Amino acid sequence: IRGSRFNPILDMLAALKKGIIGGVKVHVDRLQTLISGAVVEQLDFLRISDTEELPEFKSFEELEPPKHSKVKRQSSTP
Amino acid sequence: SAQDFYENYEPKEILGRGVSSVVRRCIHKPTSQEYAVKVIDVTGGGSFSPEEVRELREATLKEVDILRKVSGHPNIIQLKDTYETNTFFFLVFDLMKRGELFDYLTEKVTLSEKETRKIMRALLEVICTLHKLNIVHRDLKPENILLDDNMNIKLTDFGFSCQLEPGERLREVCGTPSYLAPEIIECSMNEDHPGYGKEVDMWSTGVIMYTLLAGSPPFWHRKQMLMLRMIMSGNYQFGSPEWDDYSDTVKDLVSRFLVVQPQNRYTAEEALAHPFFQQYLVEEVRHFSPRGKFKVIALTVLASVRIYYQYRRVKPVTREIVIRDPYALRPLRRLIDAYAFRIYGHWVKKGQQQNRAALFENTPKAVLLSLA
Amino acid sequence: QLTEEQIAEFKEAFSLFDKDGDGTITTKELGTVMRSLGQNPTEAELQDMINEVDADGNGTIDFPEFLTMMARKMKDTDSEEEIREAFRVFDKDGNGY
Amino acid sequence: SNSGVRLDGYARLVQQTILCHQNPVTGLLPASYDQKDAWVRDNVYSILAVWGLGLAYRKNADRDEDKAKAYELEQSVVKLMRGLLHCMIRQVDKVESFKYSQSTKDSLHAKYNTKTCATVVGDDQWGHLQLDATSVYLLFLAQMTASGLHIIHSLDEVNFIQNLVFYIEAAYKTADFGIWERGDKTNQGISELNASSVGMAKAALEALDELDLFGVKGGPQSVIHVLADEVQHCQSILNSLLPRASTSKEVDASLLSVVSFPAFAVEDSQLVELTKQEIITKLQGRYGCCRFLRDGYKTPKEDPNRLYYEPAELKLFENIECEWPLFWTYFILDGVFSGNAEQVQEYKEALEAVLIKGKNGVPLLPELYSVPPDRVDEEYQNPHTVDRVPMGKLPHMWGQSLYILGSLMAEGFLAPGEIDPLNRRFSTVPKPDVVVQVSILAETEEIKTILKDKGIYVETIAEVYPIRVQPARILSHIYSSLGCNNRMKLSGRPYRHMGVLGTSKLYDIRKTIFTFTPQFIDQQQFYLALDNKMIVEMLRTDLSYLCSRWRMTGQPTITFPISHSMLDEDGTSLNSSILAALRKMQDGYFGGARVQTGKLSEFLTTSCCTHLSFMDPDFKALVLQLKETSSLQEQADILYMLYTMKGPDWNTELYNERSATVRELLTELYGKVGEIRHWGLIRYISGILRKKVEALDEACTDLLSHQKHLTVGLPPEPREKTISAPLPYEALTQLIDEASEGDMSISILTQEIMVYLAMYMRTQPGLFAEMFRLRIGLIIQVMATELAHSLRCSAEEATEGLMNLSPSAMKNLLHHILSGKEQWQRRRRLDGALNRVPVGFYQKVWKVLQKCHGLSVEGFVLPSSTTREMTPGEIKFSVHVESVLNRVPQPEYRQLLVEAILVLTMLADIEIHSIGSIIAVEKIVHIANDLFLQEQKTLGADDTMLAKDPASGICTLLYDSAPSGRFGTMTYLSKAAATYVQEFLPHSICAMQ
Numbered sequence A: 001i002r003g004s005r006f007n008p009i010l011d012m013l014a015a016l017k018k019g020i021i022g023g024v025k026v027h028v029d030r031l032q033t034l035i036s037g038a039v040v041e042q043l044d045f046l047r048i049s050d051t052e053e054l055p056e057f058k059s060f061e062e063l064e065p066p067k068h069s070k071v072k073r074q075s076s077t078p
Numbered sequence B: 001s002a003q004d005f006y007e008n009y010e011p012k013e014i015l016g017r018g019v020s021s022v023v024r025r026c027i028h029k030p031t032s033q034e035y036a037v038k039v040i041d042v043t044g045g046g047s048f049s050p051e052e053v054r055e056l057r058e059a060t061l062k063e064v065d066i067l068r069k070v071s072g073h074p075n076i077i078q079l080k081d082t083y084e085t086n087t088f089f090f091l092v093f094d095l096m097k098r099g100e101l102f103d104y105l106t107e108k109v110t111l112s113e114k115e116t117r118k119i120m121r122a123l124l125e126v127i128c129t130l131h132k133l134n135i136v137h138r139d140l141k142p143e144n145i146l147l148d149d150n151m152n153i154k155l156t157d158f159g160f161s162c163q164l165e166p167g168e169r170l171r172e173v174c175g176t177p178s179y180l181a182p183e184i185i186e187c188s189m190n191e192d193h194p195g196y197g198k199e200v201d202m203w204s205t206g207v208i209m210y211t212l213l214a215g216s217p218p219f220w221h222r223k224q225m226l227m228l229r230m231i232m233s234g235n236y237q238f239g240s241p242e243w244d245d246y247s248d249t250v251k252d253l254v255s256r257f258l259v260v261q262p263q264n265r266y267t268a269e270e271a272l273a274h275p276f277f278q279q280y281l282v283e284e285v286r287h288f289s290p291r292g293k294f295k296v297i298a299l300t301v302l303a304s305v306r307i308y309y310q311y312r313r314v315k316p317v318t319r320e321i322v323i324r325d326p327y328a329l330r331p332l333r334r335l336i337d338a339y340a341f342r343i344y345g346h347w348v349k350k351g352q353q354q355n356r357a358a359l360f361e362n363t364p365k366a367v368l369l370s371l372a
Numbered sequence C: 001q002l003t004e005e006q007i008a009e010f011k012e013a014f015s016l017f018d019k020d021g022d023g024t025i026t027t028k029e030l031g032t033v034m035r036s037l038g039q040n041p042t043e044a045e046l047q048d049m050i051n052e053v054d055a056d057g058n059g060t061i062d063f064p065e066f067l068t069m070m071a072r073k074m075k076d077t078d079s080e081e082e083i084r085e086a087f088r089v090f091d092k093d094g095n096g097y
Numbered sequence D: 001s002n003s004g005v006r007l008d009g010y011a012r013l014v015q016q017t018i019l020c021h022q023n024p025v026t027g028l029l030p031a032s033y034d035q036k037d038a039w040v041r042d043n044v045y046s047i048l049a050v051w052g053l054g055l056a057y058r059k060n061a062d063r064d065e066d067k068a069k070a071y072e073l074e075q076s077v078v079k080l081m082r083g084l085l086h087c088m089i090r091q092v093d094k095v096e097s098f099k100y101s102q103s104t105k106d107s108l109h110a111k112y113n114t115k116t117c118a119t120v121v122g123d124d125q126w127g128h129l130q131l132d133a134t135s136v137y138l139l140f141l142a143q144m145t146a147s148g149l150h151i152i153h154s155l156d157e158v159n160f161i162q163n164l165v166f167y168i169e170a171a172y173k174t175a176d177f178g179i180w181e182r183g184d185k186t187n188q189g190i191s192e193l194n195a196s197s198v199g200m201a202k203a204a205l206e207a208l209d210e211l212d213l214f215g216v217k218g219g220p221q222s223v224i225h226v227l228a229d230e231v232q233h234c235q236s237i238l239n240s241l242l243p244r245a246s247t248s249k250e251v252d253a254s255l256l257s258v259v260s261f262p263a264f265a266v267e268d269s270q271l272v273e274l275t276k277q278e279i280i281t282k283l284q285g286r287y288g289c290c291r292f293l294r295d296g297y298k299t300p301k302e303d304p305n306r307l308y309y310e311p312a313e314l315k316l317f318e319n320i321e322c323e324w325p326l327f328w329t330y331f332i333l334d335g336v337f338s339g340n341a342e343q344v345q346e347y348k349e350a351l352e353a354v355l356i357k358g359k360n361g362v363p364l365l366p367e368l369y370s371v372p373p374d375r376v377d378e379e380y381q382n383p384h385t386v387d388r389v390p391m392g393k394l395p396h397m398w399g400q401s402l403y404i405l406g407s408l409m410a411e412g413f414l415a416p417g418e419i420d421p422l423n424r425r426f427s428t429v430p431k432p433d434v435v436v437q438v439s440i441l442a443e444t445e446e447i448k449t450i451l452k453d454k455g456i457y458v459e460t461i462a463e464v465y466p467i468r469v470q471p472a473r474i475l476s477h478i479y480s481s482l483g484c485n486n487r488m489k490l491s492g493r494p495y496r497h498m499g500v501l502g503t504s505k506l507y508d509i510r511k512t513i514f515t516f517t518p519q520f521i522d523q524q525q526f527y528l529a530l531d532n533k534m535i536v537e538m539l540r541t542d543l544s545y546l547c548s549r550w551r552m553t554g555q556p557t558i559t560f561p562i563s564h565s566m567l568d569e570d571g572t573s574l575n576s577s578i579l580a581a582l583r584k585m586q587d588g589y590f591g592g593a594r595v596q597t598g599k600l601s602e603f604l605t606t607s608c609c610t611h612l613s614f615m616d617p618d619f620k621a622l623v624l625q626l627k628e629t630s631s632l633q634e635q636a637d638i639l640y641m642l643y644t645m646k647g648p649d650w651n652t653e654l655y656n657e658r659s660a661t662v663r664e665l666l667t668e669l670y671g672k673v674g675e676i677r678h679w680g681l682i683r684y685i686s687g688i689l690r691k692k693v694e695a696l697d698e699a700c701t702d703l704l705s706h707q708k709h710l711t712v713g714l715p716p717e718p719r720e721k722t723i724s725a726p727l728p729y730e731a732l733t734q735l736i737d738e739a740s741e742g743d744m745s746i747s748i749l750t751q752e753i754m755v756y757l758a759m760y761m762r763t764q765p766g767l768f769a770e771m772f773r774l775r776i777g778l779i780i781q782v783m784a785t786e787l788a789h790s791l792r793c794s795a796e797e798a799t800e801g802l803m804n805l806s807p808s809a810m811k812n813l814l815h816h817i818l819s820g821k822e823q824w825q826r827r828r829r830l831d832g833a834l835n836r837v838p839v840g841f842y843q844k845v846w847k848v849l850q851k852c853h854g855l856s857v858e859g860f861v862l863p864s865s866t867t868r869e870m871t872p873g874e875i876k877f878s879v880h881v882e883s884v885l886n887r888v889p890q891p892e893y894r895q896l897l898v899e900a901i902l903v904l905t906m907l908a909d910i911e912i913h914s915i916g917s918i919i920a921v922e923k924i925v926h927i928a929n930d931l932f933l934q935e936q937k938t939l940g941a942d943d944t945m946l947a948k949d950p951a952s953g954i955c956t957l958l959y960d961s962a963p964s965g966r967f968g969t970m971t972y973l974s975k976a977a978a979t980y981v982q983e984f985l986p987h988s989i990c991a992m993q
Ligand SMILES: Nc1ncnc2c1ncn2[C@@H]1O[C@H](COP(=O)(O)OP(=O)(O)OP(=O)(O)O)[C@@H](O)[C@H]1O
Pocket: B015, B016, B017, B018, B019, B020, B021, B023, B036, B093, B094, B095, B096, B100, B143, B144, B156, B157
């Protein structure tokens, strides 16, 4: 999102928000609304596993802001 | 450029106004500071010719040059960053949470002895520092001096102040009508007197001290001509019921600070050498003959006897005297003066027409006022 | 105008006024000095004296305040009254000197 | 699992406490006890626990029992919401009638009956105006819709919701009965503005800004369009009206519901902390927090079987007010929501003790705790010392539901992001900055060329064919057709003006991008746009306004066409002011905003674009004389007479080819005069046309938000009725016209003056300080007198000069007078005319009345028995004091009385005693005048110096005398007051300190 590539990303995001991108119709809404009322896949084999310790899975986490430069998403600056 | 200033300083709510300037707070984005930014235009809304614009630009560049000359002084205001655009001036300074000396003085009417002592000490320090660099401010006014959270006074308005050289004198006529020396009026009569000098700042300090102590400017009249004649004549007087309860050192300092003759006026170094600003911590060279010890013992006994009489010399309420004259009681006079000032505290701003001495009328409003 | 000897005498008097060096004459030290001299001022009278001598209500006396108080002018009648009172206090014995 | 057991226990507790009174068929829960009545707010707050339990149960999916329980809870919530929606649609007539002319008799009833969804009470036996309940219902409906639940279900229901939004958006300028449904402290059938109401309404409008009620499957035809100007006005009102509760209450515990989890409608976290601290200091008790100071609800006195309590609450209801644990639940919610953990633990520990057990050991939250009648004096002498007893609704559904929700939040079974999917938790995050974009368009080729040779590149009106530019009236008429349903007798949004925040955004209709100019550039509506200095000044003002808040997503865009009216006399170059403004903005800085010049197509790439789906498909002798007369002022005069006698709408028959009515001739004359720029008959034309300044009601409510009183016209005793509450535009215009009477131009001058006052209040809220009431008539008299003094002319010449001055001159003169800058007699007259008094004057007068039997002002009397009835912080006491002091019609005498009162207060501070009699300030000032005359005679002043007032008997030198000094009037007033005190003392003085 830095440098001269800032504009194409905004154009693609606006195309996604409009409703149709690349000849394909898409819908934009909150994740919680989309999840509710939808079919969910069940993976019950993990519970049946006899492993003493359940494996730990690392999920995507929010990246904390830096405390040295504090780049608060400045302009494109070509 | 302007883009760098915009990305570096964030305009905020207005903190002050001028003849053609607006003062607003700014925040230094890399540092999250609380500095102040001053915005002054060039064309004045298209109301003046480009000659006025170029004169204003020259004044601003002279101001920033003089300020950068004296940069680094903690007592003097500092110019952190300067910017120049086609139609706007951007300057960065240090913001203070306290107002100017005018606001504090009009709130407190009269300040304490320690406060006035430290204020004149700081003013003497800054003026002697300026003299060391051959700079004349000649615009020392109570409104033009500010304060901070530490009750420290910092001189500002350096747009007026310019560099000087030995052997040359200036001739411009200006300033507050009550803040002029006999030198300026002598020069401006027709052509006789050479020009400006150094003692203008000394009389500025004197009138500052007089205004802070007595609560009113030493010279004030309903007519411009009368007040300029009184200032030129140098016929100032000390109030009878106001200056009685003060130490003699302040009378002497004010008297030598208001001397009409520039040659006889005390220098800043001479003022600093006075015992009023002199302080002592500890010494071990106080040795003399037994005659000195006897004199010290006698003086100590005299001082003890003097303080032994302070409580018995106090006066009672004396309600009858209050009926005849409410000015006899100093606390009552101070209270009524403070109440009167609080009633009319919204008519004290810049301008010779209305000032603190307007509120006070010591002269009797009788047939004698007709004579002039 | 003052003198160096006068300044030294005032400093010595200020130092001797308080038993402990703290820059203040202190109400307790002044009361003890008064009792030692042979006087018993009232608490209200002492508080009134402290308030009158001081320029505000802080309730403490500094050396510049003492110097300013000693700088007052008694004129003529007050001076002779003061010296007569001092002589009477000093002349406790019935000798006339 | 342990979590499953805890959830089962919580569900059992909820079923046994709240859900046991589900009341099928309708689904509206009874409001506890033997009431058999349903409150919409109570039901909405009670359903929160059920909604939270359902949300928690939904997470533990993949099981039939858990899925069934979650579905049952969600369907119960949906059924309750649908029952409330049916209840509210049952008063479509009331909603539509309230949409025009806001009155307490037109709003829907707050009290709704049980099953069969009928009305249980009449329209006059209860307070049927509570915008807070409807607004919180809308906000919670939006929250549930965003969560995933389907509640709003029909296009007719969507239109009804839009009508409800239009009904609620006017909350910032109307007075309701509040949450307590009792108005101020004394009921007396009165209502007043409440901060909670406007805050919750603003939060509701923010929640429904662009929400899709049909969910992910919804289309463009099922979205709400909510304007941002009203929300910003509400925010400003709240910011200027949240150092206390309201204009009458110093503090209310209901203010927590604005600065906490419910609706999160507050910014400036420092103000939130200050409000919480003051609420804790003034309301916290041993069994919760009291509702507000001086409340008599549930008291052992005051005849509980009575209403409209008389003003006798001096000390009866003081220090013995009841305490409600629901505010403790609100505090624990606030602690557990944002970032607090220790506060949650301490508040839970405190609340666990005040809990009362029920059947089978069930927790129950009592409604309030009341002081026993026997131990009343002990509580009065020793506050918060006696022990209260539980009484009221033992199973308080609101408090129990709030406590259950808080406990579920604290236990970790639920997250803050579930109840608030609309991310309202970060409303206190500071806004970094905003960049505003502006565009300049030339009407004609000549303007474009004139801009070109001056180094500015613009685009003409043409060549931008994909983009169309019209004034704001078209946008207004377009929005007036929003939410219109002929079958349901819905008239849609009424025609209202829009601020600069509405025209800034871009609009897309019929697949075409539309840009609208700001509403202020319409010279047809009013003559204010004619002045160039006015244009640039309030353009800077609106730029600053846009740069300040900009709460709406996207970048803004401003269009500034350069018309033909601001050109110079020769008509060949632009004026200095507009050229300077363009040059300043070109440097990326104008006023207090950062701007950048550019092309509209460039701004189209990134801006705020909105799509409007709803727009998809002898008389003859007089006429001859008027035609032939010169002296255009006399021509307008004759036109006014013709309009007065027989020209309301009758054709004058001036022309033969075409019949033009009187209005056409008036418009032609106004257009002709606008070119010459002569302000001699412009006011007359404006008065004849009855043109009114736009957003006058907005200015009035902004002025009244600071606890100020306004009076219209010169004051006689009978007329000039004061205004204390916000008033509709039609009634305000009627009052202005009635005050102006036949002077017509007086109304226009008054309009200009109050609009200037409103403009100056926002920019500099320090000049109007210490002022309690503002009188336009007195101000007009003062400016006329000042101009006459300056010009040394007559009153008629002064009025003519005032009429001839430009609006910028009016603003400059008003600013100079307000500052009070430019002898002592004139200054005293100006001070008295504007009734300027010190800030602590009210407190000093209250203390004097406490320490004295009364005050005599040479007429009537002011008893000291009123000090117990009122408080120094109450505006009623201040207005009573002002009315008492307003009897004397001499401003100099008023100032003399003020300073006499001040010196009397200083004396009463000096002397510790009770006067025990009535003191006359008139006698005091007379004694002071006599003493001054005697002193002047002794000094040597002759007869011409010792003058006498023609109608006051006061020496002119007294008015000319300075306040302080050796011979100032302060000393004489003090001497006179002391002499009066000695005259009213037992032959001695009692002044000691
Ligand atoms: N750091 C600051 N914070 C707030 N206000 C300030 C600060 N520095 C200066 N000011 C104010 O801005 C003004 C500075 O003087 P300026 O030259 O802009 O005004 P002026 O009308 O030309 O005349 P003067 O020099 O007499 O003030 C004063 O009104 C002063 O109170």
